[PDB]
Amino acid sequence: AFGRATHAVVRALPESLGQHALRSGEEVDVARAERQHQLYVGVLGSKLGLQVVELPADESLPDCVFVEDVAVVCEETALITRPGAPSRRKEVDMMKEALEKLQLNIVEMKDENATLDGGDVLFTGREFFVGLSKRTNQRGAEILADTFKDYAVSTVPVADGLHLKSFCSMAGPNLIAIGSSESAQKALKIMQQMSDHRYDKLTVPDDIAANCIYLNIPNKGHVLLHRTPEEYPESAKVYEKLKDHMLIPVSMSELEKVDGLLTCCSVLINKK
Numbered sequence: 250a251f252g253r254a255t256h257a258v259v260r261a262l263p264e265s266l267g268q269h270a271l272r273s274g275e276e277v278d279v280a281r282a283e284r285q286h287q288l289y290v291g292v293l294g295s296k297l298g299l300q301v302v303e304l305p306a307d308e309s310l311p312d313c314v315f316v317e318d319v320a321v322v323c324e325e326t327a328l329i330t331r332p333g334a335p336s337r338r339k340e341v342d343m344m345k346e347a348l349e350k351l352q353l354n355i356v357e358m359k360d361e362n363a364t365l366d367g368g369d370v371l372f373t374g375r376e377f378f379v380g381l382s383k384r385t386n387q388r389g390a391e392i393l394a395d396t397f398k399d400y401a402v403s404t405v406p407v408a409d410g411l412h413l414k415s416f417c418s419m420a421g422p423n424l425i426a427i428g429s430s431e432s433a434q435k436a437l438k439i440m441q442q443m444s445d446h447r448y449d450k451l452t453v454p455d456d457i458a459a460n461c462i463y464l465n466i467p468n469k470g471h472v473l474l475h476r477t478p479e480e481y482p483e484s485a486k487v488y489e490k491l492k493d494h495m496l497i498p499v500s501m502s503e504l505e506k507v508d509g510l511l512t513c514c515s516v517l518i519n520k521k
């Protein structure tokens with residue numbers, strides 16, 4: 250069942266993030282980001298009842314909170330990535346430990362010519378879309394392709410120093426949340442040509458706000474964490490039409506300053 254999860258790996262942000270985290274804007278309020286990430290953890294863990302493994306902040310790694318970038322997980326198989334940003338590679342160490350406690354099958358992307366961000370991987374439930382970006386390359390998607398054999402993998406040129414999931418993400422089975430920008434619409438279509446099947450599409454006015462979290466919770470159903478009507482009111486209005494979804498607005502303004510979206514701050518795990 251798509252978007253069904255039992256666990257989630259997250260990680261506390263270090264104080265060094267406000268000043269030291271890679272980006273591309275306002276000064277970051279660390280107190281505010283702190284809070285926001287707390288709320289974010291509670292929605293998944295307290296409100297939604299997933300077992301959360303919280304990793305401790307490594308001050309040394311100001312980007313460490315964005316855990317999605319370091320691992321892709323599908324069924325019982327963990328891909329531990331080789332992040333495009335050289336400096337962020339020391340964040341895999343601590344994630345591999347955790348994914349080992351979860352008794353998950355590990356594969357490490359060690360190939361020295363292979364970069365891959367999890368931020369660049371869209372998993373539709375039916376297949377894989379990997380974005381070819383400034384951080385994820387051919388040699389990485391091929392290894393991602395090689396790790397998840399039961400699934401078809403195809404690559405979508407993502408430009409402009411972004412990621413694939415900066416303008417899209419799954420908002421339900423067969424439903425792909427999508428930005429209006431011509432960048433996104435382009436990849437969107439590029440994506441469909443390549444599928445053995447047609448996806449439904451949820452379009453939203455703000456590229457960033459098409460990054461959301463869909464979940465299939467036991468005795469809850471469709472669940473979507475999405476950006477607030479404050480941050481992105483015209484996109485919130487679009488999510489508001491999803492009347493089969495338990496809609497939980499989740500703010501993420503601070504982290505966005507450093508290119509942090511909703512999906513980046515967790516790795517989701519379905520366990521028997």
Ligand SMILES: *[C@@](N)(CCCC)NCCC[C@H](N)C(=O)O
Nearest residue numbers: 271315368412414415508509513
């Ligand atoms: C999430 N996945 C957003 C980009 C990919 C959709 N990752 C944010 C990472 C933010 C760090 N500061 C970085 O620059 O890697």
